[PDB]
Design a protein around this ligand. Structure first.
Ligand SMILES: CN(c1c2c(c(O)c3ncccc13)C(=O)N(Cc1ccc(F)cc1)C2)S(C)(=O)=O
Ligand SMILES: CN(c1c2c(c(O)c3ncccc13)C(=O)N(Cc1ccc(F)cc1)C2)S(C)(=O)=O
Ligand SMILES: [Mg+2]
Ligand SMILES: [Mg+2]
Ligand SMILES: [Mg+2]
Ligand SMILES: [Mg+2]
Ligand SMILES: [Mg+2]
Ligand SMILES: [Mg+2]
Ligand SMILES: [N+]
Ligand SMILES: [N+]
Ligand SMILES: [Zn+2]
Ligand SMILES: [Zn+2]
Lengths: 184, 368, 368, 184
DNA sequence: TGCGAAATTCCATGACA
DNA sequence: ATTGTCATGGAATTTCGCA
DNA sequence: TGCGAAATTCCATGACA
DNA sequence: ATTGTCATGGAATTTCGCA
């Protein structure tokens, strides 16, 4: 069996609804399985249509052999299947109610949700503009298991934006109080 | 003047009037019998006015001015006085073409790493497609990997929107552009400062300086044209295909595609290369680093037989950028303050500001 | 196809499949272990589709197409099949640039006599001066003697008015022009027929063919510019001065002014030449005839190292004249009917008409 | 003394009033003394102004050393003198009532008047358009005294419009009757 | 240890507003 | 304060397959 | 029968929409 | 059925002035 590579498998999933930001409501999350690299795309709906439009952007940069998802409606539609067939991409579904990725991906998806939650509170409506800085953060975050960031594994170089301050990622006492106020 | 010509008439030797010719008087005028015929020797004090009158008939250069003068006159070293006037005729200096070529082009080193340097430019206006008229083109210096963004204008705002999306992937050390309005605005300067990105500008009116992206523009247009043959020019929906198509095209001289230089491995595209299937990613990134350093790099071509190279303190003239009908193609003479490299200089205009300028937009002032 | 690959698998020799390599089966596919790795040998009947798929990714040329194919496949003489497809891709043929230069320029013989051949052209639009916007420029081939006429339009009517005045002096055998609207109208053709004047046209979109007058345009504009420095561009009142100034300017290579070539003696202008003062007119016209025949004539320059020359029956393509945005720069292939000279040909378009065309507006179709 | 040359002397004079032609009324006549070459310029008046404007055309082709004329008002004006001085042209006047040229010029001026008269009758108003063909005729007319036409003496070549039919130049019986009818 | 032919490399040409 | 580039397809040169 | 300097010729460069 | 041209000013080459 051959070693694991970038573009071998992309793991996709939606996050949201979120509070509106420039008319956007969801984030399509794409994680490269081998490297842990994250691409985020803001959408208005978890539809096949928004998924196709967003993946068209990413797949005009690099095409995965396999896309892995849960059995979200957007991903099990025959339109999405057509889309993937057209591009020679194999689709792969986790069984209903039993989501499985890899340790690396799971932990990454975790960081994504926590980091999102953190920076939204205070400014729950300004997340669209922050998506770039979020991805840089995620992709320049050191992997305990491998000696390298996703940036490094993807491009084979150090980055020009290293994130040396490995951040708290936890909500400070104020933010817990603020987050429970916005939910009122 | 009159004293010199006097001593001459009474048969004495004056320096530069060859002794073997007979100098006489006739009609109140000093004359001499030269092989071509009898010419008037005017007094020195008259010579500048003669040269100037001859020159002004059609603002002729060295020989064509001399040939008029020689029709009537002779005196020592006529061309010396002709050249003196040519060097002082403001009109000839700013209207005439240069007849000296630039020194050979530099081949700057390829950026060492992906993301070290971006070259960006606009193409357009193109025929309207979904309301769009332009394309922002971003080319990574090291890899040639290219990103395309359709815009409605070559504006800072659209540049910033596009680059916020791109720099989601990585932030480049330097962005090199030409002096298009979108890149030179203070808004764009701020945008770059906010991100620790250094902005680097081509010398003005010198698209070769953006050669990396310009050359990619060519391929972009060439591919779009081929895909549009016998169809309406609906190019918007093709930008993505073109991006992917070119990023995965081999450079015959490099033997690598820009994608391979960026990632060290093909993605799921047609005819993907499989040579590193058995390598670990780490072994693969190892081979990539080696491949990146050993790429062919061109050398400075031979100089043409009549090139000039700039020297500090030299008088040179900047080409007028958009010269009006029937107006000079050159600015007034100015001075080389600093030679930044053999093809780039700083000049003081004469007003005057410091300008950093390409040698291609300069001629060396004639006649010193 | 399948038969050939069969005999191959059972260890027999098929021509062009080198014997020293082992050809096996794996996953329903014929394979072979080559120095670079294991490649699939597809059946002959599959090869054209492969080459085409590779080529179509970015419509790449020989090597960049081959490099994609070689990633997965091997078979005998792959480039032969690549080149075959390139020669059939209509899109590549009409979009790509040529990489072969034209053969060296001809230096046609100087017209033997004044009035043998006029070259005429328009300059403009210029800035409005007394209501005028253009200049008709008429240059006598032999002498370079030039006449200037201000016009309001580059029209046949203004051409005819101007030439009625000029041909009061003499009637020329031939008038050579470019294909400007004013010269190609049937009104102008009639005007010439009425006078026994032969009209001679440049090949289309090839201003070098009117080089004689074009080059005079340069001097005309250069002098006007110099005289207009620091003044409003009121050029109308200067045409006469410029005419006279240039007709009396020396050509350093000839040592004669156009006036001298036309008349054999200077008129009352500044610095008039006096060498024939003692000759009879007849002796003077005698020396003129001698001077006219002995003028320097340039020779055809050396060919560039990769020029092409047209051959009867060759496939060549005419450059599109005013190509629209994102459209091919070349017409479909057409055939050389006749080689009029090494730089001028007649082609059948494919519709098709006979066109007489400059080699500079042609490329030789690639890949035959 | 040096031999006679083209541009040594131009002889100028006006012919008219004539019947209007495209608004024109006179012909300024210029004859090169050495060659007998003729330039004709249609004018609206025998004024200094029309003379200057017409000679500006000719003198942008070739400049005479000497212009010879009678004491016409247009030629004795100080404006015309200024004009000539500017151009280094010497002015020369025949004494009043005693016009003198050369044999060649006299005969030429004669031919001009006779040829004009001839072609005007029948079409007395269409002479403006005929001035070119008139000058070609005159300048390609063989000189009995010299073996050459003015064209040949000026340019030193044969012309492309030779006038082999040395014409009658006299008025036919019809034209004498027609000319005496137009004068009614 | 050398031949004919295929493969690879060379590189002038031209186009990026 | 900055700097030309590189796909292209014939030709020239090297390598391959075989002996 | 040769030297230094002036004169002449050579010719690449660029521009004619 | 038509076809590049030639002013320009440094450099290269020839000629001049003198011996
Ligand atoms: C009209 N100019 C401009 C050009 C281009 C720009 O992108 C410009 N952007 C902004 C402003 C002016 C621009 C450009 O792509 N060019 C084509 C090109 C490319 C490479 C070459 F070697 C030659 C020509 C010319 S310019 C630099 O003044 O001449
Ligand atoms: C725009 N073109 C035209 C040109 C000229 C004309 O007079 C034209 N008249 C009519 C129609 C089109 C004309 C002209 O003077 N040119 C300048 C020039 C001169 C010499 C060169 F070597 C290069 C360029 C281009 S063209 C021939 O299509 O390219
Ligand atoms: Mg989901
Ligand atoms: Mg630009
Ligand atoms: Mg550009
Ligand atoms: Mg024209
Ligand atoms: Mg022209
Ligand atoms: Mg009179
Ligand atoms: N460099
Ligand atoms: N010829
Ligand atoms: Zn001048
Ligand atoms: Zn193609």
């Amino acid at each position: 069996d051959r070693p694991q590579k970038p573009f071998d498998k992309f793991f996709i999933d939606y996050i949201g609804p979120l509070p509106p930001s420039q008319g956007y409501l969801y984030v399509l999350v794409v994680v490269d399985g081998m490297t842990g690299f994250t691409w985020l795309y803001p959408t208005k709906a978890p539809s096949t249509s928004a998924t196709v439009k967003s993946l068209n952007v990413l797949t005009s940069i690099a095409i995965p052999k396999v896309i892995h998802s849960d059995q979200g409606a957007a991903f099990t539609s025959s339109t999405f299947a057509e889309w993937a067939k057209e591009r020679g991409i194999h689709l792969e579904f986790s069984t209903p109610y039993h989501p499985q990725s890899s340790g690396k991906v799971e932990r990454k998806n975790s960081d994504i949700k926590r980091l999102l939650t953190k920076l939204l509170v205070g400014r729950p409506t300004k997340w669209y503009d922050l998506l770039p800085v979020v991805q840089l953060a995620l992709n320049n975050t050191y992997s305990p298991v491998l000696k390298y960031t996703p940036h490094q594994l993807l491009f084979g170089i150090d980055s020009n934006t290293p994130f040396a301050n490995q951040d708290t990622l936890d909500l400070t006492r104020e933010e817990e109080l603020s987050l429970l106020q916005e939910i009122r | 003047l009159d004293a010199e010509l006097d001593q001459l008439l009474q048969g004495h030797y004056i320096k530069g009037y060859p002794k073997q010719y007979t100098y006489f008087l006739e009609d109140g005028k000093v004359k001499v019998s030269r092989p071509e015929g009898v010419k008037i020797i005017p007094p020195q004090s008259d010579r500048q006015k003669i040269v100037l009158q001859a020159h002004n008939l059609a603002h002729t250069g060295r020989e064509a001015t001399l040939l008029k003068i020689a029709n009537l006159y002779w005196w020592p070293n006529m061309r010396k006085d002709v050249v003196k006037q040519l060097g002082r005729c403001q009109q000839c200096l700013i209207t005439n073409a240069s007849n000296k070529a630039s020194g050979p082009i530099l081949r700057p080193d390829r950026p060492q790493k992906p993301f070290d340097k971006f070259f960006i430019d606009y193409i357009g206006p193109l025929p309207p497609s979904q309301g769009y008229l332009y394309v922002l083109v971003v080319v990574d210096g090291m890899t040639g990997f290219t990103w395309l963004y359709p815009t409605k204008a070559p504006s800072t705002s659209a540049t910033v929107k596009s680059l916020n999306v791109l720099t989601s992937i990585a932030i480049p050390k330097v962005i090199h552009s030409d002096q298009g309005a979108a890149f030179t605005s203070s808004t764009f300067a701020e945008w770059a400062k906010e991100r620790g990105i250094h902005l680097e500008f081509s010398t003005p009116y010198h698209p070769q300086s953006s050669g990396k992206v310009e050359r990619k523009n060519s391929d972009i247009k060439r591919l779009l044209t081929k895909l549009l043959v016998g169809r309406p020019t609906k190019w918007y929906d093709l930008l993505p295909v073109v991006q992917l198509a070119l990023n995965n095209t081999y450079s015959p001289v490099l033997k690598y595609t820009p994608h391979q230089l960026l990632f060290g491995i093909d993605s799921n595209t047609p005819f993907a290369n499989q040579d590193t299937l058995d390598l670990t990613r780490e072994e693969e990134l190892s081979l990539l680093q080696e491949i990146r350093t050993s790429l062919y790099h061109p050398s400075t071509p031979p100089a043409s037989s009549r090139s000039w190279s700039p020297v500090v303190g030299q008088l040179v003239q900047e080409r007028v950028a958009r010269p009006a009908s029937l107006r000079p193609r050159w600015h007034k003479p100015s001075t080389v303050l600093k030679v930044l490299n053999p093809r780039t200089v700083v000049i003081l205009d004469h007003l005057g500001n410091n300008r950093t300028v390409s040698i291609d937009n300069l001629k060396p002032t004639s006649h010193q």
